[PDB]
Ligand binder design. Structure first.
Ligand SMILES: [Mg+2]
Ligand SMILES: [Zn+2]
Ligand SMILES: [Zn+2]
Ligand SMILES: [Zn+2]
Lengths: 123, 64, 115, 14, 49, 46, 261, 82
RNA sequence: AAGCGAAACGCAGCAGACCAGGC
């Protein structure tokens, strides 16, 4: 994860968005953060989607992931506030590549596109 | 009040040299020859053995 | 009352980065490497190894304050080269030199013990 | 600027 | 109030306009800073600290 | 209440209680010293 | 634009000191190696004491601080032990520490010399230098009839930057250019100065001629060990330590180059 | 006093500058409106200082004379030296 | 995507002498 700027409405929402972003990153520090009883095969032994299992596990408990993700210094920038593993915002420290914006972030729009013979969609 | 363990300057052990140093002086040795026999070549360790005062020996004259 | 812990010179505090790279805007192809929890032991060897690279125009190190345990290394190179690349090669070169010095020391020790 | 999130399959953290 | 005193020491690594203040004196003395949307964040974190 | 104090010369752990005169029951000395605590007192060799 | 090809020539090797010479290397590498010998070579030493009883004339901090300065044999154990900061145990486990014990009481009328011999360790590999099978035993404290000293110490792995007790050297005689050819020094009266043991000049001469194309080479060394680590183990552990520091720095560097984008 | 003929110096004194920056900094600290741009300025001192360099401070200095009269000189009418 | 037993609770000072010492 190079950078992430969240603009959640609530602290709980901020935590949920960060967890989703960390899981989507697939960073090794998050895979190693998996702890306790997590199964990637159901009772029928079918193979579940690992991303969904990780997302569910980390949404159930994110304390370990936040603790092991890592911390970095914050470059003072107007409107950007860091966030710490204990969820309390900070101005000097923050999670690695994580920022919180209080002014909002911009929005859905459909764009016409051209598709060639080999199904390669281009703008 | 008791001989230090290491030399403050270099770090050479001197705590095991005090009793031996006194043991040489009573044997009619000169302070310089005694310090040479103990292997103290640098003037920093020689400073440690030649300028020390065993005050603990006087503190033990008082009942505990 | 204020004696700073001794381990504070070498252990990295929680969330503090070991090295930060800042591009110098005064002249082109220059950078500042701010390394935390280090001293003249690495700054001098890296400086000297950088001076030997002819593609390096400037190589110096400084300690902003002796009480602090950080160090700043400035590196300026030619346009065809890069300061990060010079700092990387300089570390690789020092590693090879120490590896070689270690093997030749083990050999010298063996030759001296066997006589 | 309240907005939806399309498909979703997640619960709340603790 | 809001004063201090201790022994001085040389420090060539400081500018002429700088003074090296220990962490103890700096921790006991304080400055009443007014709250604004520009510093509400920093001051908040410092209060919770 | 149970104070196993020490005497200056006689060094006896006489159980001197409160509301009493400090006096060694074995030799009569008037000066008493307390015994080392039982708490775990550690020390970093630095 | 590359490294050098240094050589080594050992002129004296004993159990107390080692005298060697490094050629074809930069002054920075030679000085950093000298600094590592004193400050970045791991060694085992006492760093935790629990005084259970001390009736001696020396207070507790005086005894604890003394005990820390006692050298402990750490030739092959220091590479296996770990630092308490990285160890995933608590208290003082056998993988990150070595337990010591002392129980002495002066029952006789003669003064009892509490020495390092009385320090009983759980590991036979880590023991006081003087206790290793001449040299006398280190003196901790003298006791009078009726006095007692009983404690339970723990040794840890550390280096010189944390405390001088973790310094395995008793002097590092670093020298280069015995004959002042590079003129790094300027003797106002060169005839009044003595000749170094590594000098190669006639007594009629005071210093070698100036060499403009000269560079610092042929660095001389004399690593006198305290006794804990053999004189050669200090040098090997030093070069390995400095190479590890550079390897870790290169790792953090690559992590910062990659983190850029 | 007749504002058409003000005899005081046209430059702002070091004391007038000190008190102007101080009072304006206090105002900004009390969430008062800012007149100039604030690209990366939050500390009220740096804001008041940029406002002085920009000459956009809404303050009038009432210079009292010994006779009892006074001359009201605005921060925009005075020439800043330092 | 997944899925099982299908009430009530952060103190406090003498003061005033005199002596020694600090840059
Ligand atoms: Mg003075
Ligand atoms: Zn010495
Ligand atoms: Zn008695
Ligand atoms: Zn351990």
């Amino acid at each position: 994860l190079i950078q992430l700027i969240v603009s959640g409405k609530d602290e709980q929402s901020i935590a949920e968005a960060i967890i989703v972003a960390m899981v989507f990153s697939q960073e090794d520090c998050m895979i190693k953060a998996v702890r306790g009883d997590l199964n990637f095969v159901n009772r029928a032994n079918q193979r579940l989607n690992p991303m969904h299992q990780l997302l569910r596990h980390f949404q159930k408990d994110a304390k370990v992931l936040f603790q092991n993700w890592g911390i970095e210094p914050i470059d003072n920038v107007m409107g950007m506030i860091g966030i710490l593993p204990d969820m309390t915002p900070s101005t000097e420290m923050s999670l690695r590549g994580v920022r919180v914006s209080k002014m909002g972030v911009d929005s859905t729009e459909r764009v016409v596109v051209s598709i060639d013979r080999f199904l390669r969609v281009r703008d | 009040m008791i001989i230090p363990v290491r030399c403050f300057t270099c770090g050479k052990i001197v705590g095991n040299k005090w009793e031996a140093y006194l043991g040489l002086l009573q044997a009619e040795y000169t302070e310089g020859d005694a310090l040479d026999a103990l292997g103290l070549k640098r003037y920093c360790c020689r400073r440690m053995l030649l300028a020390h005062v065993d005050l603990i020996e006087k503190l033990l004259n008082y009942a505990p | 009352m204020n004696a700073p812990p001794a381990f504070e010179s070498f252990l990295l505090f929680e969330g503090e980065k070991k090295i930060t790279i800042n591009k110098d805007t005064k002249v082109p192809n220059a950078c500042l490497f701010t390394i935390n929890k280090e001293d003249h032991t690495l700054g001098n060897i890296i400086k000297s190894q950088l001076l030997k690279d002819p593609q390096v125009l400037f190589a110096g190190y400084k300690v902003p304050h002796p009480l602090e345990h950080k160090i700043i290394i400035r590196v300026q190179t030619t346009p065809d080269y890069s300061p990060q690349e010079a700092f990387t090669n300089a570390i690789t070169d020092l590693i090879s030199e120490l590896s070689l010095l270690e093997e030749r020391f083990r050999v010298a020790i063996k030759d001296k013990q066997e006589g | 600027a309240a907005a939806a999130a399309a498909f979703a399959a997640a619960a709340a953290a603790a | 109030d809001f004063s201090a005193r201790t022994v001085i020491t040389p420090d060539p690594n400081l500018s002429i306009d700088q003074v090296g203040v220990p962490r103890s004196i700096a921790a006991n003395m304080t400055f009443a800073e007014i709250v604004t949307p520009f510093n509400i964040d920093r001051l908040q974190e410092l209060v919770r600290r | 209440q149970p104070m196993i104090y020490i005497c200056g010369e006689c060094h006896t752990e006489n159980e001197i209680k409160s509301r009493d005169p400090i006096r060694c029951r074995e030799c009569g000395y008037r000066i008493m010293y307390k015994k080392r605590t039982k708490r775990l007192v550690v020390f970093d060799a630095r | 634009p590359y490294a050098n090809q240094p050589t080594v020539r050992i002129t004296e090797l004993t159990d107390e000191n080692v005298k060697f010479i490094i050629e074809n290397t930069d002054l920075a590498v030679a000085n950093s190696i000298r600094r590592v010998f004193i400050a970045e070579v791991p060694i085992i030493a006492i760093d935790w004491v629990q005084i259970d009883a001390n009736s001696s004339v020396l207070h507790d901090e005086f005894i604890a601080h003394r005990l820390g300065l006692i050298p402990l044999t750490s030739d092959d154990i220091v590479d296996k032990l770990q630092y308490s900061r990285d160890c995933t145990c608590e208290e003082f486990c056998p993988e990150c520490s070595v337990e010591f014990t002392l129980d002495v009481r002066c029952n006789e009328d003669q003064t009892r010399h509490v020495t390092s011999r009385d320090l009983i360790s759980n590991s036979p590999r880590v023991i006081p230098v003087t206790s290793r099978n001449e040299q006398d035993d280190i003196l901790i404290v003298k006791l009078r009839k009726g006095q007692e000293l009983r404690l339970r110490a723990y040794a840890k792995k550390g280096f010189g930057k944390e405390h001088a007790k973790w310094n395995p050297t008793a002097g590092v005689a670093f020298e280069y250019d015995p004959d002042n050819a590079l003129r790094h020094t300027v003797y106002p009266k060169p005839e009044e100065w003595p000749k170094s043991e590594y000098s190669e000049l006639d007594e009629d001469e005071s210093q070698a001629p100036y060499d403009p194309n000269g560079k610092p080479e042929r660095f001389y060394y004399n690593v006198e060990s305290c006794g804990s680590l053999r004189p050669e183990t200090i040098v090997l552990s030093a070069l390995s330590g400095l190479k590890k520091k550079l390897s870790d720095l290169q790792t953090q560097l690559s992590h910062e180059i990659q983190s850029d984008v | 006093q007749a504002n058409q003929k003000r005899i005081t110096t046209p430059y702002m004194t070091k004391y007038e500058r000190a008190r102007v920056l101080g009072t304006r900094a206090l105002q900004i600290a009390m969430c008062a409106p800012v007149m100039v741009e604030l690209e990366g300025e939050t500390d009220p001192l740096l804001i008041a200082m940029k406002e002085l360099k920009a000459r956009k401070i809404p303050i009038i200095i009432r210079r009292y004379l010994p006779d009892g009269s006074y001359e009201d000189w605005g921060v925009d009418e005075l020439i800043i030296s330092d």
